[PDB]
């Protein structure tokens, strides 16, 4: 009974989340990509191997691959935007 009497608010907030997800799709469509090393800034450069300096030490290098990978939570399409906005609305991982 409590669920039935409160269905009006759920529809309104779902519609608001949908609108914000559409706006977020328009704003951050595909812009969340990044390379494995913060030196190459396009997919044509994020290929091959690179030297990684562990913990910022210049005397402790290690070879690692370059991968042009998308973010775990992004705004590519409507479903991804809705998921990201849900995680934000749960007040968790939203600063990142």
């Amino acid at each position: 009974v409590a669920i039935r009497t409160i269905g009006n608010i759920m529809i309104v907030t779902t519609l608001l989340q949908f609108m914000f997800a559409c706006i977020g799709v328009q704003l951050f469509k595909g812009k969340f990509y990044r390379c494995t090393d913060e030196a190459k800034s396009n997919p044509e450069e994020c290929r091959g191997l690179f030297i990684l300096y562990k913990d910022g030490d210049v005397d402790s290098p290690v070879v690692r691959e370059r991968i042009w990978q998308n973010s775990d939570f992004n705004f590519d399409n409507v479903l991804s935007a809705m998921m990201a906005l849900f995680t934000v609305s749960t007040f968790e991982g939203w600063p990142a």
């Binding site: 290929r47 690179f50 030297i51 290690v62």
Partner: protein, 93 residues
């Protein structure tokens, strides 16, 4: 071979591409095509003076092509553009 600490081949010239440079990029492959004509001059020099040590062309794109071909020697941090012999010929004091 004698007067050489490694196993070498005179049939062609080896190419060293540093780790922080991706082979197969447009810049590198283009440099790997027109430099393939140096191998004939590498053999011609060795014919006249058989007691000739490494002949190397240090490209400004990073890759170094040396003759005779021999396998390269932890991680590899070699870069031909930072070598003392490259720097003196790329500029003045």
């Amino acid at each position: 071979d004698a007067n050489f600490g490694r196993q070498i081949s005179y049939q062609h010239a080896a190419v060293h591409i540093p780790t922080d440079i991706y082979e197969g990029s447009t810049i590198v492959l283009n440099e790997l095509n027109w430099t393939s004509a140096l191998d004939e001059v590498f053999k011609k020099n060795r014919e006249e003076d058989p007691s000739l040590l490494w002949q190397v062309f240090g490209s400004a794109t990073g890759l170094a092509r040396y003759y005779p071909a021999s396998p390269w020697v932890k991680i590899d941090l070699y870069d031909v553009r930072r070598r003392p012999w490259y720097i003196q010929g790329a500029a003045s004091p």
